[PDB]
Paper text:
[name]-1 and other retroviruses integrate a DNA copy of their viral RNA genome into the genome of the host cell, a process that is mediated by the virally encoded enzyme integrase (IN). Each step of DNA integration, up to formation of the integration intermediate, occurs within a series of stable nucleoprotein complexes (intasomes), involving a multimer of IN and a pair of viral DNA ends. Because integration is an essential step in viral replication, intasomes are targeted by an important class of antiretroviral drugs, the IN strand transfer inhibitors (INSTIs). INSTIs work by chelating the two Mg2+ ions, blocking the active site and inhibiting the strand transfer activity of IN.
Numbering used by the authors:
A (entry chain C), G (entry chain I): 212 to 277
B (entry chain D), F (entry chain J): 222 to 268
C (entry chain A), E (entry chain G): 1 to 228, 236 to 268
D (entry chain B), H (entry chain H): 2 to 44, 57 to 139, 149 to 228, 235 to 270
DNA sequence: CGGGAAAATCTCTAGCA
DNA sequence: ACTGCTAGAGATTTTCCCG
DNA sequence: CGGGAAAATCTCTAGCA
DNA sequence: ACTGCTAGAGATTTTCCCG
């Protein structure tokens, strides 16, 4: 039930930026999604990121590649 | 308070000092002679 | 430094020497010379060296008009994905910009449009078009094209592709549609090696799926957390850390000094 | 890895597809695809119908994505080959169109339309479109008073049909359905690409005869030998390209 | 990949897909797809992302004309130091550019002048002026202002100072001379915290002194070095390393496998 | 040999391929239809 | 004689750049000066640098400051 | 550090200046300056003369740097205050002019010239210039045939005098001499700045009474106590600002 | 050896038009 | 065969100064 | 564990006008 | 109260592949 939904939401990849860094960070794991904020885990570091700085997808290619 | 000197719109002449109303990431909102203006932080200096 | 300061300000009033010059010439600490400079209105001639970052929410599109071979091309880009829609229009008017916007809103979930202050984008007709389609209108700071960096860059890319394929079409409109096709489906790169069309499909489908999944999770996972405070709503737990939202303020706290009820 | 036998048993018992086995048993999609294709007893997204309708003396050219019900429509000045080719090139630029179904009309059999289809890689073949023309006409009659010109009303109707009208099993709009279907097609194409990439490799393990390579993991190699799937360590097997 | 390649080139001829697009769509190695792109003439639309570096020998000056309040300002900068000389001229002509250059050569050791291809700088009169004063003339690649980055940047700085002090002078020529004064002596910074005037004096004096000192050293220190070759002239020794010049080729070799005679 | 594609002078249209005669740091010298041209490396691609 | 001239020439400071680096390096010590090349020591590393990429001075301020 | 006693002995024996002691004995310039100023028995670069000469009915305004012999000259349209002020502002922008010596002429006592001097910080005071006018006239007569206009010939003469004519003890040109003199003046001003910065500090060592601070080195502190210079370790002394 | 404050180095921008 | 640079604003890192 | 080759990440640029 | 970006060229670093 809940655990399946949780692992499904953590399968998504998040690309994001910090307020003063124009470079896009690597794919971080999605933990929670809100209206204005997204909560991610990037290299064992839990970061809260505004929705306007986050690109969330799946990356079908990797979901097929295993 | 803060002093803001700024370049507004295609006018090379820097103006100010203006009262700082709001500082965001990328832009600032200022008041200069009762004329509220929105200026990118690239075009303003806050002192 | 009273004598040194006064001789410095007199020098600055005439020459406007920078803080290094007064510090060397008048044996002043760097703070004092920088104070003399900073207190001079005529020496405030440069802004901070930085660049902002434009919104990339899944619903924002950036629209602009570009010009090629004497014609007007209306261009829209989905900021999150880089997927573009372009059309040649006979004139930069609010009527046809509104028509383009109605079509776009009917084909994709457009929540917000970000434009410069061109008269076509600020027209009453476009405002009515956005209101009926439920699209929020955002206007850049005037004469700041950087606020439209995405669409402005897409104008360059679109014109670049048009030049490449301009010889396979007699009319410019056909070449523009060919270039739009090439950009959306025949150029791969970016954050997932996607084409723009694949990327926008992924972005929109992912938004829908994540919304549904998080709705189910919040329906099932209903807990209140006390840390250090009030009954903060539980968002996520695990790996020795707990994410909570206390009074519309999302913060990350360790599992220690926190209890989930 | 460990769940391959469980997936085989589940597929034999319930005739499940590869997606279900991959999702439930945490297996790579290629292994589940091999499992689903190993049994003989267990054996659209780019199709559009194009037609012209007439309304108030004006020609409305309508495109329907068959799988989802999604609609692309605009008033065109005349029912000629040039406007049809322009509209179809537009559509091919916006969505991944592979095949168009038409009614052998004059504007659909023109050389301009055939040239556009050849350029965009669209395959031309000469009842959904009729019912959807009826539905679009209904929505247009509903929202005609909100616009002076017919084209604006048509685009309002397209917007309403694609996003405001919901139905079916899940109560989804047409736009949601088309997005989901295209995402599934993207997944299928990615899986096919990876299968094509890996099917040219042969693995010698423990040496035993060549075996079909299925997955090259971080800690194991999944192979198929004599219509059976075996997991072997990476250091115990050699992978070569034939 | 013979079938995959051929389908890729046919796709590229129509759409000009980038190497990623063909590699994904046609299961090609990155090298093959990049080969298809690189072999397409119409896809060669961008140069390498780099910037050269302009000469900063002690004798090079960069000259340019700028325009302010309807007048012409001829500007020269000593590249090594940033020291500038400017003068208002009534017209961009070879006569007065040559006169400015004669004055500059009479005041400072000008060995080389680097200009864009403005008609005044390419004039016959300026060529005669340089020939009599023994000044080598260097012309930038046409329509490449980056080749004059130093003087072009100085144009910005000079205009910036002129605006600051424009109200203390009635005429523009007086303001230009005031701005030149301020830049050369009232602004400190750069590689030594110098003003531009101090820096140019240091550069020129250091050049003279180093020339004399090295002349004396080479007069005294006359040795030939064999390493690994021929009798390479000795340049410098110490700290376990020897610097030699073998057939007009200066190279650094360790003290080992080298003998000084 | 090398193929050079280049932008010469205020003309946005890229031209080539031209024969590479000389490669320096910052600029290249090329021959295109017997017309020797000097192009900054910012405005050329050598293949 | 020679040693005094050598130490005098090594008192000079050299500012320089590499062929693909627009930033100016710190003050390196001058070892030898030629018509087209200068030989420097920067952080116990002997580098040959073209004359057109080298700014050589003394820095009077440090020669007074000791 | 170790050579302070040797420098003191050398200065007492030979009345040497601080530059010689610093160069020969590897001492910081401040310590040598203190040594040279400690004995009572041992006790220009910004001065220019400005004058107008007449030639071929045209006015030539000449500037001579007294210390070096360096010449700045140009033909001016008229002998008025405006042109003199413009020329002097030019010169002050090019070289560090502190004082100008003139002949109390009408163009030199004008309010415009005084205002220019006040703006540039030049001090006005009302035989080198005469001889140098003669020399410039000689060079102009030598190179007059090489130009049509008098101003170009004057600038050629200025170039020749400053860089092609060499003389004196070292056989140097005027430009070399002015560059050397200005460099020496820069050195003197830097030394004065550092002396002014350090003279406000007092040092307590080993505690003993306050002593004048001379140098704050990486491994030692040089102080002057009771008209004598002593080297003490940094950790053995405390430096405070008064 | 330890923080704090000032100095130094570093990062980045507009304008030169 | 020739070539981006400069200097100011703000951030971040070293150095130094007294314990 | 060791190099080599390919993949991935990184650095930087023009143009959008 | 809002905001440079994109994608290609060339360089440099990781990862992987067989020993
Ligand atoms: C008629 C002559 C002869 C041939 O070409 C023209 C045109 N031109 C154009 C610029 C210019 O575009 N400056 C902006 C800029 C851009 C980038 C950069 F790195 C440096 C910069 F200064 C000049 O400055 C300039 O002096 C000229 C000029 O003199 N001429
Ligand atoms: C009449 C409307 C209303 C108000 O202002 C004008 C003028 N304008 C000027 C540019 C422009 O300068 N592009 C070059 C550029 C420079 C920097 C950057 F980061 C991005 C860039 F694209 C545009 O692109 C543009 O669309 C307009 C426009 O539409 N208008
Ligand atoms: Mg616009
Ligand atoms: Mg634009
Ligand atoms: Mg020019
Ligand atoms: Mg210029
Ligand atoms: Zn000021
Ligand atoms: Zn191509």
């Amino acid at each position: 039930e809940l655990q399946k939904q949780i692992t499904k939401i953590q399968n998504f990849r998040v690309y994001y930026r910090d307020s003063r860094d124009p470079v896009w960070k690597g794919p971080a794991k999605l933990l929670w999604k809100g209206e204005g904020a997204v909560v991610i885990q990037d290299n064992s570091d839990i970061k809260v990121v505004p929705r306007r700085k986050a690109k969330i997808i799946r990356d079908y290619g990797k979901q097929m590649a295993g | 308070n803060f002093r803001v000197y700024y370049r507004d719109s295609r006018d090379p002449v820097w103006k100010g000092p203006a009262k700082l109303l709001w500082k965001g990431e990328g832009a600032v909102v200022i008041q200069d002679n009762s004329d509220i203006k929105v200026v990118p932080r690239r075009k303003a200096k806050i002192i | 430094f009273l004598d040194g300061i006064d001789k410095a300000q007199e020098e600055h009033e005439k020459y406007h020497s920078n803080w290094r010059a007064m510090a060397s010439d008048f044996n002043l600490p760097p703070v004092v010379a920088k104070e003399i400079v900073a207190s001079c209105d005529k020496c405030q001639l440069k802004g901070e060296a930085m660049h902002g970052q434009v919104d990339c929410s899944p619903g924002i599109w950036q629209l602009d008009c570009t010009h090629l071979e004497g014609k007007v091309i209306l261009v829209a880009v989905h900021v999150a994905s880089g997927y573009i829609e372009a059309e040649v229009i006979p004139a930069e008017t609010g009527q046809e910009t509104a028509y383009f916007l109605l079509k776009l809103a009917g084909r994709w979930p457009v929540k917000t449009v970000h434009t410069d202050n061109g008269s076509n984008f600020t027209s009453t007709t476009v405002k009515a078009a956005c209101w009926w389609a439920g699209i929020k209108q955002e206007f850049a700071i005037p004469y700041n094209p950087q606020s439209q960096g995405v669409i402005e860059s897409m104008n360059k890319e679109l014109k670049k592709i048009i030049g490449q394929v301009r010889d396979q079409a007699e009319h410019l409109k056909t070449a523009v549609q060919m270039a739009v096709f090439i950009h959306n489906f025949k150029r791969k790169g970016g954050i997932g090696g996607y084409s723009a069309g694949e990327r926008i499909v992924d972005i929109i489908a992912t938004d829908i799926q994540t919304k549904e999944l998080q709705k189910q999770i919040t329906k099932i996972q209903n807990f209140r957390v006390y840390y250090r405070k009030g009954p903060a709503k539980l968002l996520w737990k695990g790996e020795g850390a707990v994410v909570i939202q206390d009074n519309s303020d999302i913060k990350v706290v360790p599992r220690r000094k926190a209890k989930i009820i």
